[PDB]
Amino acid sequence: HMKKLNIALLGLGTVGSGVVKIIEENRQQIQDTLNKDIVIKHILVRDKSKKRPLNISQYHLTEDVNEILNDDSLDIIVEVMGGIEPTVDWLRTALKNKKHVITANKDLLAVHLKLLEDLAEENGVALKFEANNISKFMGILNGTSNFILSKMTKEQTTFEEALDEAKRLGFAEADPTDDVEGVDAARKVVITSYLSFNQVIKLNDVKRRGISGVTLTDINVADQLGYKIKLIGKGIYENGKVNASVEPTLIDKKHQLAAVEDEYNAIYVIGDAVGDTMFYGKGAGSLATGSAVVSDLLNVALFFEPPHFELKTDKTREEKSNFFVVVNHVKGSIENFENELKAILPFHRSLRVANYDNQSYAAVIVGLESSPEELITKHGYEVDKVYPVEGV
Amino acid sequence: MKLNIALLGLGTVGSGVVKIIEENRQQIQDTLNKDIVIKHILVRDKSKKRPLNISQYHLTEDVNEILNDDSLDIIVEVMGGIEPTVDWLRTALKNKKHVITANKDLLAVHLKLLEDLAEENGVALKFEASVAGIPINNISKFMGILNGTSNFILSKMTKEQTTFEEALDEAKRLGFAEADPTDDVEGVDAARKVVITSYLSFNQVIKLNDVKRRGISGVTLTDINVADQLGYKIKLIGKGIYENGKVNASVEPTLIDKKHQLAAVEDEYNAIYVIGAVGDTMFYGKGAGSLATGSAVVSDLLNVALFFEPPHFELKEKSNFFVVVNHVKGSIENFENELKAILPFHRSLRVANYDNQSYAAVIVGLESSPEELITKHGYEVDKVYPVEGVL
């Protein structure tokens, strides 16, 4: 009665080891409940000679990916290796050979997801990835960076101190660049833009600034103006074009994102249409990723014998920018600065100013068409920096 | 080339389902080789005007015309009601018809009996609701703001410093509250959602009357402002805790720590905060609208059509209270000392001025409400609200 589901795993780090253990703990349940025996026939690793737990030595380990790609008995390839090259080519081959692919590859971007999704549909197999009317999303997409900002804000420390504390507590890696320079968040913006808008952008299309230049002063001045500072990954889909960014952003304290602290993440979604929504939760770990992979595996196993959007233009049943500008080497009183800004700015909804430091002021300006940075510079102010301002 | 369906009900949700099917019919035909035919639509009154506005479908007032039509593959119910709606669905299922329902009045007892009856007859039962798409485990606890009107009222009292009565009239004026707002303000709607959420979160059926329920009509500006000074907002919280085989479900005014993600949920927005191990999660949003519900129904419809008709094993609680006491003679220090003497052991205690000869206390780490105890020591307890989010 029972049919074998022959799979192979590409990679055996923490995620791969987790997938194996999960399959093992549940094999009997999956057999007796779903009448499918999952066999892990091959596991690709980089070094087959290195010492591993006893359970791993039950399985056939190989260093040759072609052994897996040429094995016609295989039904599904599970990739947890990472990398673009050559990993993506491996997956293309799998798909072309009529193998279903489940991947938890963290380095895949929208270009890759698109090309694999099509190639899969083309070959009549599934592609499961473990990374409408949506017009805009804003997210806190990197735990470490958010942890650091939370620590600076709550404990009144410098970025440097907060970063060291994050290293000490395990949140930050020894080289934290990917987190603190916003690269990880930018990758997630690419992926989220693909899933939200069905549009492919490149990583380098995401305008990116990290948090390493955020200071306690920025935090406390924002605070006094009614804002928190978060690293926000943002995508706006206007007139056929996605505008994507990651950068330090002031968020009104009453906005739902303002409350998202420490290593928690959140994605705030805005639509045509319906009211706003948000999903909040911590970054997924190895066990949860492994768990998703096996879920996807069981789902595809019921794919045994589309890229469709439902159009909702039955909906006929019925975008300014804000900025935080820091100027230094000023030049007279805060009232004078305020007055000069009122004279020079194009039309806008509101303007507030505050003391920032010695001969330094900040302004929050709501409702401009565009950054006033150049304009303020041309009027003889040294602009330290400009952060976008979000929420209401 | 196919899929004969009938709709029970044609309000905004039903009208949305029809229009979505129409807009996508060609795509569903050419891309999934299935022609969806809406063969009948049951309405209570065929002579009443609607959206459509005038349409090409067969409208009927006789449900038996639909239930006896053996050409039908799927019944989509968007009518509402328990009686006779549930019986209609039982008949459909017994006649080997798949059922998709977005019925807002269904409780866990009904979902359970239909789920079983469906499995018994080898057909799908897809349940669609509600919002904060309820799916769309290892959950030990959930807390939610589950009723827009009640939350709107508390937000208005808090932000604009008005009385409950004023905030309620303003909510009526703005459309958020109905003329008889009982279902919202007495927490009944929230309690229904607690029932459903407990069923989906814990796979346990509780009755609406098992939900310990208190509405917001007794919440005053004083409660709000005292809570504010103590570091809390007041929300109407629907809560389910699954401990030792038993679900404890409630809906009542609750102090929520200001840092808690639920504290920020204002106006008509809703949210469901889920605890289990892993991190906490939350879904935030307004109560899903007609178009989104309709969209889910058609998704469920396509899913059922495409496949024409079980948890893994990753194995490898005190309470806090806000107590208001009146007709207290003596100082706040004396009250504090008297509470320290009479309470059983607990983690912490703070007291505040509430009104003339009236004090409030936030007590952390009791097993149950100290109301009876405080009463038996001769104090007049005004009320007790639970306190959440501490730590």
Assign domain B1-133+286-312 to its CATH superfamily.
NAD(P)-binding Rossmann-like Domain (3.40.50.720)
As a three-state string, the secondary structure of chain B is CCEEEEEECCCHHHHHHHHHHHHHHHHHHHHHCCCEEEEEEECCCCCCCCCCCCCCCCEECCHHHHHCCCCCCEEEECCCCCCCHHHHHHHHHHCCCEEEECCCCCCHHHHHHHHHHHHHHCCCEEECCCCCCCCCCCCCEEEEECCHHHHHHHHHHHHHCCCHHHHHHHHHHCCCCCCCCHHHHCCHHHHHHHHHHHHHHHCCCCCHHHCEECCCCCCCHHHHHHHHHHCEEEEEEEEEEEECCEEEEEEEEEEEECCCHHHHCCCCCEEEEEECCCCCEEEEECCCCHHHHHHHHHHHHHHHHHCCCCCCCCCCCCEEEEEEEECCCCCHHHHHHHHHHHCCCCCEEEEEEEECCEEEEEEEEECCCCHHHHHHCCCEEEEEEEEECCC
Instruction: Return the structure tokens found at A50.
Output: 């290195």
Q: Where in chain A is the domain with CATH 3.40.50.720?
A: 1-131+282-310
Q: Does A220 touch chain B (CB under 8 A)?
A: no
Query: How many pairs of residues across A and B have Cβ atoms under 8 Å apart?
Result: 108
Q: How are beta strands B98-101 and B125-127 bridged, if at all?
A: parallel
**Inter-chain contact A314–B286, Cβ cutoff 8 Å?**
no
Q: Which residues of B touch A312 (CB under 8 A)?
A: 20, 23, 291, 295
Half-sphere exposure of A33 (CA within 13 A, CB side): 12
Task: Give the fold, CATH level 3, of A1-131+282-310.
Answer: Rossmann fold (3.40.50)
In chain B, CATH 3.40.50.720 covers 1-133+286-312
Alpha-carbon distance B10 to nearest alpha carbon in chain A (angstroms): 14
CA A110/CA A98 separation, integer angstroms: 22
Q: Evaluate whether the domain defined by A318-388 bears CATH number 3.40.470.10.
A: no
Kindly report the number of other CB atoms within 10 A of residue A164's CB atom: 14
Q: Residues B20, B25, B31, B32: what is their CA dihedral angle, to the nearest 10 degrees?
A: 90
B193, B233, B235, B239: the active-site residue? B193
Residue B15: list chain A partners with CB under 8 A: 317
Which DSSP string do the residues of A271-336 spell out, in sequence order? ESSSPPEEEEEEPP-HHHHHHHHHHHHHHHTT----------GGG-----EEEEEEEES--S-HHH
Give alpha helix (H) positions in chain A: 14-34, 65-69, 87-96, 110-123, 143-155, 159-168, 177-180, 183-197, 216-225, 286-300, 334-344, 373-378
Q: Which residues of A touch B16 (CB under 8 A)?
A: 314, 317
Does the beta carbon of A46 lie under 8 angstroms from any beta carbon of chain B?
no
- The DSSP bridge partners found for residue A3 are A36
B13 labelled as ligand-binding? yes
Nearest to B291 among A279, A291, A317 (CB): A317
| DSSP secondary structure code for residue A130 in this structure | -
Q: How was this structure determined?
A: X-ray
- Are A256 and B278 in contact (CB < 8 Å)? no
- In chain B, the residue whose alpha carbon lies closest to the alpha carbon of A20 is B314
What is the CATH architecture of A132-281+311-317+389-392?
Answer: 2-Layer Sandwich (3.30)
Which neighbouring-strand residues pair with A207? A245
DSSP of A63-99: S-HHHHHT-TT--EEEE----STTHHHHHHHHHHTT-
What does the block give as tokens for B146?
């589950």
Q: With beta carbons under 8 A apart, name residues in chain A contacting B298.
A: 310
Q: Are B261 and B274 in contact (CB under 8 A)?
A: no
B279 to A281: CB separation less than 8 angstroms, yes or no: yes
Number of alpha carbons in the 13 Å side-chain half-sphere of residue B79: 24
3-class state of residue A137 by DSSP = strand
Q: φ, ψ for residue A346 (rounded to 5)? A: -70, 180
| B193 catalytic per annotation | yes
How many Å separate Cα A251 from the centre of its chain?
A: 19
Of B264, B289, B312, the CB nearest to A291: B312
Q: Residues of A with CB below 8 A from B27's CB?
A: 308, 311
**Resolution (Å) of this entry:** 2.2
Q: Which amino acid, one-letter code, is at B314?
A: E
Beta-carbon separation of B261 and A258 below 8 A? no
Cite the residue boundaries of each domain of chain B with CATH code 3.30.70.3100.
Answer: 317-386
Judged by a CB distance cut-off of 8 A, whether residue B299 touches chain A is yes
Under DSSP, is residue A1 helix (H, G, I), strand (E, B) or coil? coil
Per the annotation, does B42 bind a ligand?
no
Using the Cβ of B347 and the Cβ atoms of chain A, whether some distance falls under 8 Å is answered with: no
Considering only CB atoms, B264 lies closest to which of A256, A279, A314, namely A256
SS3 call for A132: coil
Task: Let me know if A271 is exposed, middle or buried by CB neighbors in 10 A (0-12, 13-18, 19+).
Answer: middle
Q: Which residues of A touch B301 (CB under 8 A)?
A: none
Task: Copy the structure tokens of residue B171.
Answer: 């909510």
CA–CA separation, A101 vs A89, rounded Å?
A: 12
DSSP A259: G
Neighbours of A55 (CB within 10 A): 11
Residue whose tokens read 């995620």: A15
| Listed residue (A5, A196, A44, A186) closest to A109, CA to CA | A186
How distant is the Cα of B201 from the closest Cα of chain A, in angstroms?
Answer: 17
Contacts of A36 in chain B (CB under 8 A): none
Closest CA to A103 of A82, A129, A121: A129
Gap between the Cα atoms of A167 and A128, Å rounded: 33
Pairing state between β A76-79 and A100-103: parallel
Nearest C-alpha neighbor of B17 from the set B296, B217, B255, B228 = B296
Query: Cα-atom radius of gyration of chain A, to the nearest Å?
Result: 25
CA distances from A130 to A117, A144, A287 (A): 13, 20, 13
For the B134-285+313-316+387-391 domain, the top CATH level (class) is alpha beta
Measure CB to CB from residue B314 to each of A22, A273, A275 and give the nearest one: A22
Asked if B223 and B166 touch (Cβ cutoff 8 Å), the reply is no
The CB density around residue B82, as the number of other CB atoms within 10 Å, is: 13
Question: Which of A254, A256, A310 has the CB atom closest to B295's CB atom?
Answer: A310
B81 and chain A in contact, CB less than 8 A: no
Where does chain B hold its CATH 3.30.360.10 domain(s)? 134-285+313-316+387-391
Cβ contact A277–B299 (<8 Å): no
The C-alpha atoms of residue B268 and residue B148 are separated, in whole angstroms, by 4
**Chain centre to alpha carbon of residue B274:** 13
CATH code at B317-386: 3.30.70.3100
Residue intervals of chain A classified under CATH 3.30.360.10 are: 132-281+311-317+389-392
Residue B12, Cβ neighbours under 10 Å: how many? 16
Interface touch A308/B22, C-beta < 8 Å: no
Q: Is A280 on the interface with B (CB under 8 A)?
A: yes
